[PDB]
């Protein structure tokens, strides 16, 4: 008596057609759809995508499924019979591969109300493409989106829109190894315009922000300490070559070991990012110290009072000058990549 | 005569409906379910998940499957006919992908008792999501959970609960490369509250604890020895520059090679973890030794008895002072990350 | 009334045969096909392939599907019934694995016009093979192609050709971590000639160009600075051994650390590429400096005015000579790998 | 006439039931099963498993398949009809995922003899779990097993046992990158005892032994040479600081580069293994040399004949003493990890 | 009229049996099969296998498919009906996993001639196992094979043999990152001998040869230059300790950085290969230089004319002697691993 009523309502007896939309040749059916995120993030810059495991619930009205000769309000449909009912041809416009779940029971749910409203909730795993710009690495902000588009019905037939109360929700307690999923989501429309017509799609923009604290005390702070070690070489008496050449070349070797050793941890983009500018300029100052003494030793190597006054003068200017240049670069750097 | 009785009991003749729950419009069916773990652990911080291969056994009562005209107690059902019987819509609320096993025979088992009790044991492989907080790395304790939730039946229809005697069991002899699976499991309820209603779920919490002994004698001990090597530089006569500058800068280069060389082994989280604080402070002391001599050489470089007494005094304070500071940090560190 | 007309037109009543081509034993059917690229690039030199997610639309004429007793022009066909219609046996001649998409609905679309024209749009994910020549790395240009070939029909039966207006389109906003997808695509024919006959195929050539800016300020610039550091060793007075031997051997160790440290980032090809020539020659000059002083110290070590004039002369030639040789190599290098 | 006899023998006419075991309510059916290994080894300590591609042949007796009205002895069954015959519910108790092979034909084989004997040979690919203990790395011996267990039939119904002549065979010419598959296999029983009853399983134990010769001349020999380089520092006159401090600290830096450079090659276990003890003790001796001179320079730095006799005495003891300590550790090490 | 003749010839009307071989109880059917290679090579020493994407065409004679009442010669069969015809049970004896292709149409082709000849061409992707011996790395030659074996028919029923004109072909333009696919293929028989009987198989041997040019100018040449840098230490006056100890220990540190830095690029085999012998002996000579001076300084440290003549004599022998030993090893090495 429960399940032999859906065969009466969608079988060969009644004239329900599974591949004809509700309100056919009439108003476009409204689909109120909302997303719950269970798991989030296998965020990779190698393939420029991420993964998300969602419950997708989508609700519409099918007037040829209304009924009154059955006692309760809601009447659910078995997941093996979902080819017997109309469903929207929703797909995800930026997916790179996705699947259902079928463990211990097929994880699908459809529920027809007494009104004729249909609630359809599924649980799917998604590999969604979001392009990334790592020009501001590590202090970069990513925006990975999630588009929901009709595949074959235009907006004169099918209209997608978000739920009013809460569209996208995220299960609390999730943790990303790189990013922080911002709590404010950005719901937008993305309505497609092709020669076939206007196709509906609605997008959810997720804001990601990279944590920087590892790259501070593993890349930035040790390089800044090595630059200070090259600044030590200016408070040393001249013509003492092996205690000032060896210091200045050892800071070069330690900066080179710092930059090359930190190469396998940073991503494999092949363009200039904001940590490579720090390593490059912090190499140019450490190199600039030994190049400075390479000038000073040749100036004072000839031998003249002007030569010691000229050598002393160069050191006097240099001792003060290079922390000022590193301070101007140090202000312009963090304003440029951090402030904006 | 054995298998032609289940067709008599669940066929077109008898009125058994496969998608109507037992005790329909009555009490919620109890599901006594328990888990045996065969394999455990492909634990990854990159995707924040693990893998587990389980036998899931779940037992319930179906009163419209009781019988008396068959000689033995237990009557098993073929795995090809499992669509002919009601099964709970159990799913795992934190899975990221999961599958059955079908090699040489589909690894499913259903057994209907003479009482009407149904035993249903399957063998499935799971990729379950557990978020991790590596702030206390390596001396961190993880808690990876395992939730068992009804998908479409509320608690007025279906109730999950663990077995009384032993719910979760783990096959002895398993070994993880990183963690130690604790023998005490934490069985809890997790009962979900949605606008549809209260959905049953039961969770098993597994406690994991990371082994640290590699990071002692490969990261902690060599860094502590390099800090002692920077402490050697204080028991050296002053104005002997290349035997004390070169020592102090070589300890910097060896600490930098130690920290950058140990970078590819540690995980790829982008925030401050407890081994990065050890490498950072053990870099600040080794740097602080050469910065200390960079003060001492300029104090004693001018030339005055006060200058040698002032230089000697600084060395006298420093020789004693830096093992005290490393001892205070060394107590606060291991209490802070190890004791709590 | 909509969907019971396609059963009238392609069912057992009408004599439509699904595996007989249109215009059978007549003219070859024209297939106007065009490609829209959603996602592009998991470009790997390890397996010599890439990935692309496309909409493939292909249009042909089937004269035994024309109709007039139905009100509208276009009449769409359900994706479950696509075995009931003829489709071209198009495959991709350089694929290494590929699949469809079926999430929330099978992502296929077929539309029969009143004229008898059939539009067939699908959405498939592709792993396409393109062989790469990394001899000019990093300043190399790749050309990865995309072939569309008939599988069993010769050109006397089936002819593929691109759409006139726009054949290949790429969704704007895509970003590759290594390359830049050039905006000018190269549409060609590739017509196959076998003993069975001439098989149609049409190819789209995509031009990729590698970004170099990382390898400038991480590989090229630090090596050039180390070569300048070996040039510093010539403006030093002779017979001062430990300040000139230790400098020259420390530049060797820093160049060796630069070359070996940059090894895990560059690809795993086992042949000579254009960055290995830079690292090799920038090792031969840094080695050539200490080998030069290894000559100079033995010339001036014996003791004669000719010996100091001969030593001074060698330094005089060397001080000027090695930046000229590095300038000739530096012109020939960037013309040879960058200009052509 | 060949294939229309199996439809006579297992069809709707004859009373063969596919899901009722032979000799039902009688003796347990014997399954003589044997394994041929084609490929072996994707041995990973990350997931604690390996892969093996086998032919599994299993033979049993089915008395209701005996026949006499057909000319030849053996009568084979088509792989599409294997649901029409009883098969054992064998599974592998330590698999983590496994599949069949179906390329160009489904790779299954069943052959019914005139006696009623059934031979069933399949070809399957296996990911089998074996836990590993890398405490003795590299000179460790692993034992990876392979269990064959009935899934739903107890030992009162089904009994597995190996073939007498040769149970497990391995195709000659296989090569592992890490291990050596020992030629002596260890056939055992593993009979399971559950509350349902005794379930049959038979296991094959494979003995693996790791090759060590890479870790000799890449980890052990260079570290031993660096320890000898620290032993060089004792045959040097005292108060010659920069030629003995710089040697002793350069051996520390070279040992640190050796240990940190060899870190990415060794596995990612997080506990103390036998190569980490070698690197740790070979770091403690190289550190102990400079700590020894850090004592000697302070003893002889004050100035007294007793001080030079005390300094000379310390060197005299140390010159002899540290190769004896490294010899005692060098005997205890290789006996402890290599002999047992 | 085209496709309703194959139903007349292989349907329920005619007595064609799909699982009975042609010429049953007669001569063994000949299968003339040939292979075209589209893509080749995901060659991995970790799993000891490679990948290849082939067209497999196989031709045989089926005398109960000959016809004369149809106008043309060739009559093709639909890929959905391939279970209606006999096909050989060919499989690949060294595959580790393999699949078909089904994109836009199932990529299979069968064509029945008027003679009764059947042509069957498919397109499959293969992971084929070839064991590798990296003892001669990098100058090693691999031989990866490809076996085609009958699964259930002996040689009294089915015989495989290659095509006469061209059996294996490779699509031009392919590029491997490591190897060079040799143009001369080695076609062989491999006929299997089991207790069931003789099973046919035919194999194609592919010869691979590794390119070495990367390992020359990245591993061999820099190590040889460091050995020359240790040869520089012999043309230096004795009793000049810090300019000859520091040189000789810096060559040790640079050789250690060269060997440990080149470790992550070379494969993960755990046995002695031919580049590890080069790095080991090039470490023993660089170590042997400082050990030589560690003898010389103790000989000349005591003080005697014999001591300076003995010291000078040792240097005199050593200056000449070590390039001779490196020349003997350098001849024996390249003859031993390169010539044979
Ligand atoms: C889906 O939503 C749209 C938007 O409200 C509905 O279209 C409106 O229908 C009312 C009828 O009272 C008109 O007054 C509006 O002008 C329509 N808005 C449009 C066309 O943008 C549409 O009816 C809804 N679909 C269904 C099946 O009810
Ligand atoms: C599942 O377990 C619950 C909990 O015991 C059962 O509900 C109880 O039924 C008894 C009837 O004697 C009542 O007295 C209790 O108040 C009920 N507890 C509740 C509602 O929390 C329920 O009957 C069981 N299901 C079945 C099918 O027996
Ligand atoms: C597919 O395109 C070809 C190329 O136009 C068509 O073949 C031509 O048919 C016209 C008939 O008016 C001839 O004059 C040309 O010589 C043909 N060109 C050839 C054979 O290269 C073909 O008819 C088209 N297919 C269909 C079904 O219309
Ligand atoms: C499977 O093997 C067992 C072991 O031989 C058989 O059981 C034996 O049957 C003989 C009958 O002559 C008894 O004497 C033994 O005591 C039995 N051994 C036991 C029960 O351990 C069994 O019959 C075999 N199965 C079949 C179908 O023949
Ligand atoms: C497959 O090839 C074999 C080898 O030629 C054929 O066997 C031969 O048949 C001729 C008949 O004229 C004999 O003279 C040879 O001695 C046979 N050679 C053998 C048995 O090795 C066989 O007939 C072929 N199969 C078919 C179906 O024609
Ligand atoms: Cl150094
Ligand atoms: Cl280094
Ligand atoms: Cl590294």
Strand-pair category, A29-40 with A168-170: parallel
CA D77 to chain centre: 38
- For residue B141, list chain D residues with Cβ-Cβ distance below 8 A: none
* Among candidates A211, A253, A254 on the partner chain, residue whose Cβ is nearest the Cβ of B270: A211
H helix intervals, chain B: 6-10, 213-215, 221-232, 245-261, 274-302, 305-334
Q: Residue A267: list chain C partners with CB under 8 A.
A: 177
For helices A274-302 and A221-232, what crossing angle results, to 10°? 10
C253/E254 touch (CB, cutoff 8 Å), yes or no: yes
Q: Which residues pair with D188 in a beta bridge?
A: D203
Residue of chain D whose alpha carbon sits nearest to that of E132: D175
Distances (CA, A) of E179 to A61, B195, C46, C94, E144: 62, 62, 12, 20, 12
* HSE value, Cβ hemisphere, 13 Å, CA-based, for A312: 7
Rounded CA separation D269/B176 (Å): 8
CA dist., res. D35 & res. D53, Å (int): 10
Kindly list the domain boundaries of chain C, sorted by start residue. 1-211, 212-340
Query: E23 near E31, Cβ under 8 Å?
Result: no
| Residues pairing with C129 in the sheet | C49
Closest by CA position to D46, among listed D150, D174, D134, D106? D134
Q: Which helix (H) or strand (E) holds D298?
A: helix D274-302
The per-residue DSSP string of E31-56 comes to EEEEEEEEEE---BTTTTEEEEEEEE
Note the Cα C106 to chain centre separation in Å: 31
E59 strand-pairing partners: E32, E119
Burial (CB < 10 A; 0-12, 13-18, 19+), residue A4, is: exposed
Give C-chain residues touching E213 at CB under 8 angstroms.
Answer: 270-272
Which DSSP category does B98 fall into? Answer: E
Which residue, chain included where needed, has tokens 């005619």?
E14
Query: How many Cβ atoms from other residues are within 10 Å of residue E67's Cβ?
Result: 15
Substitution target from B171, B254, B256, B259 for chain D, most D beta carbons within 10 A: B254
**Residue A201: which of A91, A107, A280 has the closest Cα?**
A91
The CA–CA distances, whole Å, from E48 to C147, C271, D92, E145 equal 31, 22, 24, 12
User: Is residue A23 classed as helix, strand or coil in its secondary structure?
Assistant: coil
Q: E-assigned strands of chain A?
A: 29-40, 49-61, 75-77, 90-92, 95-99, 108-112, 117-129, 141-150, 158-162, 168-170, 179-181, 186-189, 192-193, 198-199, 201-210
Q: Which residues pair with B51 in a beta bridge?
A: B127
- Substitution site in A25, A28, A162 for ligand 1 pocket (most atoms within 8 Å of beta carbon): A28
Mutate to test the pocket of ligand 2, among B28, B29, B59, B66 (most ligand atoms within 8 A of CB): B28
- Partners of residue A276 in chain C, C-beta under 8 Å: 214, 217-218
Q: Give the Cα separation of D241 and C116 in Å (integer).
A: 96
Tokens of residue D184, six digits: 């002596």
Q: Do D277 and D138 meet the contact criterion of CB atoms below 8 Å apart?
A: no
CA B21 from chain center: how many Å? Answer: 37
What's the gap in Å between the CA of C45 and the closest CA on chain E? Answer: 7
Cβ neighbours around E335 below 10 Å, total: 10
The alpha carbon of B232 is separated from its chain's Cα centroid by a whole number of angstroms, namely 42
CA distance E279 to B8: 78
The DSSP bridge pattern shows strands A117-129 and A108-112 to be: antiparallel
CA C331, distance to chain mean position in Å, is 28
- Ligand 5 pocket, E30 CB below 6 A? yes
Kindly give the residue spans of alpha helices, DSSP state H, lying in B172-244.
213-215, 221-232
Q: What separation in Å is there between the alpha carbon of A190 and the centre of ligand 5?
A: 70
Experimental structure resolution, Å: 2.9
SS (H, E, C) D208-225: EEECCHHHHHHHHHHHHH
A28 C-alpha to center of ligand 1: Å?
Answer: 7
Go through chain E and tell me how many residues it has.
340
**Count of all residues that appear for chain A in the document:** 340
Give the pairing of strands C95-99 and C117-129: antiparallel
Q: Tell me the CA end-to-end span of chain E in Å, nearest whole number.
A: 66
**B288-304 burial by CB neighbour count: b if 16+ within 10 A, else e?**
bbbbbbbebbebbeeee
Q: How far is CA A143 from CA A48, A55, A140, B21, B22, in A?
A: 12, 21, 10, 45, 48
Q: Report the distance separating Cα E279 and Cα D218, nearest Å.
A: 9
| DSSP string of D231-255, one letter each residue | HHTTSS-TT--TTTHHHHHHHHHHH
The distance of C21 to chain A (nearest Cα, Å) reads: 26
Surface-to-core class of residue C272, CB atoms within 10 Å of its CB (0-12 exposed, 13-18 middle, 19+ buried): middle
Query: Pocket of ligand 1, candidates A27, A31, A88: which has the most ligand atoms within 8 Å of its Cβ, to mutate?
Result: A27
CA distance C183 to B34: 59
Query: CB pairs under 8 A, 24+ apart, for E190-194?
Result: E190/E93, E190/E147, E190/E149, E191/E155, E192/E149
At residue C121, the 3 state secondary structure works out as strand
User: Nearest-CA distance from B5 to chain A in Å?
Assistant: 24
Cβ distance A151 to C107 less than 8 Å, yes or no, reads yes
| Atom 2, ligand 1: residue with shortest CA distance | A30
Query: What is the whole-number distance in angstroms between the Cα of residue A207 and the centre of ligand 7?
Result: 40
**Rounded Cα–Cα distance for residues A241 and A246 (Å):** 8
Task: Using the mean position of ligand 8's atoms as its centre, give its distance from the Cα of residue D215 in Å.
Answer: 18
Q: How close E64 gets to chain C, by Cα (Å)?
A: 23
| Ligand in closest contact with the CA of B246 | 6
Question: What atom of ligand 2 comes closest to residue B29's alpha carbon?
Answer: 27
Q: Which of E107, E211, E237 sits opposite C270 (nearest CB)?
A: E211
CB-side neighbour CA atoms (13 Å) of C215: 22
The answer to whether the Cβ–Cβ distance between C229 and A47 falls below 8 Å is no
Two tokens at D175? 């090569």
How was this structure determined? It was done by cryo-EM
Known binding-site positions of A for strychnine: 194-199
| Residue listed under structure tokens 């000058």 | A321
Unique residue bearing structure tokens 């587990």: B52
HSE of A197, CA atoms in CB hemisphere, 13 A: 12
Half-sphere exposure of A298 (CA within 13 A, CB side): 10
Asked whether A170 and A40 are in contact (CB, 8 A), the reply is yes
- Of E5, E36, E31, which is closest to residue E119 (Cα–Cα)? E31
Specify the 3-state DSSP secondary structure of E139. coil
| Rounded Cα distance, B153 and B60, in Å | 15
* φ/ψ (deg, to 5) at A326: -70, -25
Decide: B227 and B326 in contact? Cβ < 8 Å.
yes
The ligand 1 atom nearest the CA atom of A30: 1
Residues of chain D with Cβ-Cβ distance to B235 below 8 Å are 294, 297-298
The verdict on whether omega for the bond into residue A138 sits within 30 degrees of 0, i.e. cis, is yes
Instruction: Tell me: is residue E276 an annotated ligand-binding position.
Output: no
CB spacing of B257 vs A257 below 8 angstroms: yes
Min Cα–Cα distance to chain D from E234, Å: 18
């Amino acid at each position: 008596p429960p399940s032999e009523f859906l065969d009466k309502l969608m079988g060969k007896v009644s004239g329900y057609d599974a591949r004809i939309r509700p309100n056919f040749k009439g108003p476009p059916v409204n689909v109120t759809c909302n997303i719950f995120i269970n798991s989030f993030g296998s965020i990779a810059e190698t393939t420029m995508d991420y993964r998300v495991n969602i419950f997708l619930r989508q609700q519409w009205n099918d007037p040829r499924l209304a009924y009154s000769e059955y006692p309760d309000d809601s009447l659910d449909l078995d997941p093996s019979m979902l080819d017997s009912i109309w469903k929207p041809d929703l797909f995800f416009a930026n997916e790179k591969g996705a699947n259902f779940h079928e463990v211990t029971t097929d994880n699908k749910l459809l529920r027809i109300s007494k009104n004729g409203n249909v609630l359809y909730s599924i649980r799917i795993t998604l590999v969604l493409a979001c392009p990334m710009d790592l020009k501001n690495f590590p202090m970069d902000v990513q925006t990975c989106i999630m588009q929901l588009e009709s595949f074959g019905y235009t907006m004169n037939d099918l209209i997608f829109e978000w739920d009013e109360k809460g569209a996208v929700q995220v299960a609390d307690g999730l943790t990303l190894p790189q990013f922080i999923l911002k709590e404010e989501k950005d719901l937008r429309y993305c309505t497609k315009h092709y020669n076939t017509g206007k196709f509906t799609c609605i997008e959810a923009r997720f804001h990601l922000e990279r944590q920087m604290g590892y790259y501070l005390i593993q890349m930035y702070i040790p390089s800044l300490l090595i630059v200070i070690l090259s600044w030590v070489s200016f408070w040393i008496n001249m013509d003492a070559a092996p205690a000032r050449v060896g210091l200045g070349i050892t800071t070069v070797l330690t900066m080179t070991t710092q930059s090359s050793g930190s190469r396998a941890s940073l991503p494999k983009v092949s363009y200039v990012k904001a940590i490579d500018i720090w390593m490059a300029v912090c190499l140019l100052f450490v190199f600039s110290a030994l190049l400075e003494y390479a000038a000073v030793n040749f100036i004072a190597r000839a031998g003249t009072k002007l030569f010691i006054s000229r050598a002393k003068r160069i050191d006097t200017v240099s001792r003060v000058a290079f922390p000022l240049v590193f301070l101007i670069f140090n202000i312009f750097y963090w304003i440029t990549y951090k402030l904006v």
